């Protein structure tokens, strides 16, 4: 029933989230901050099932 | 228009750095707006003097075309 009724999903794409993270975490590029590196490899192909 | 940082005219050693652009329709307020006719007549007389001794190059075309030079834009 949930699958049949919950048709779409609402979320913000990755680009905006990365921009916000960059603005909030004002750090020079070329410094190897793993907080920024880890998120850069994400995606939301699977959001409906989750 | 090209925008620069404020420049201190007093210190000769001062340098300029560029900062951005802005589009503007205001024509530059140079001189010759007061003496527009005095220069138009002068240049047209120079051109007709050159043409009269020359091979009759249709002065009407020259007078019509010389006015094209100031209808340009900085883009």
């Amino acid at each position: 029933l949930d699958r049949a009724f919950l048709d779409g999903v609402g979320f913000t794409p990755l680009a905006e989230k990365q921009q916000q993270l960059q603005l909030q975490l004002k750090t020079n590029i070329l410094t190897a901050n793993l907080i920024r590196s880890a998120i850069n490899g994400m995606n939301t192909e699977s959001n409906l099932e989750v | 228009r090209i925008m620069f940082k404020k420049y201190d005219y007093s210190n000769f050693n001062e340098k300029l750095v560029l900062k951005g652009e802005q589009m503007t329709n205001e024509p530059p307020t140079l001189l010759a707006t007061t003496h527009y006719e005095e220069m138009d007549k002068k240049r047209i007389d120079a051109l007709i003097k050159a043409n009269q001794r020359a091979g009759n190059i249709l002065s009407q075309s020259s007078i019509e075309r010389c006015r094209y030079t100031d209808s340009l834009d900085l883009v």
């Binding site: 680009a15 921009q19 960059q22 | 925008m3 900062k19 951005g20």
Partner: protein, 50 residues
Amino acid sequence: PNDEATIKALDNVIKQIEALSVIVNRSEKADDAQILGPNTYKQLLEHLFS
């Protein structure tokens, strides 16, 4: 790409702040104020009869 997408926000946050001194310092700042002018009452329509 994130840098290319955030440079526009940076350009806004710097120009829309530090270049507004140019327009602000321009003469005839906002509008007329503190100065009043003459006026008169406006007649209405009555159409009386006896």
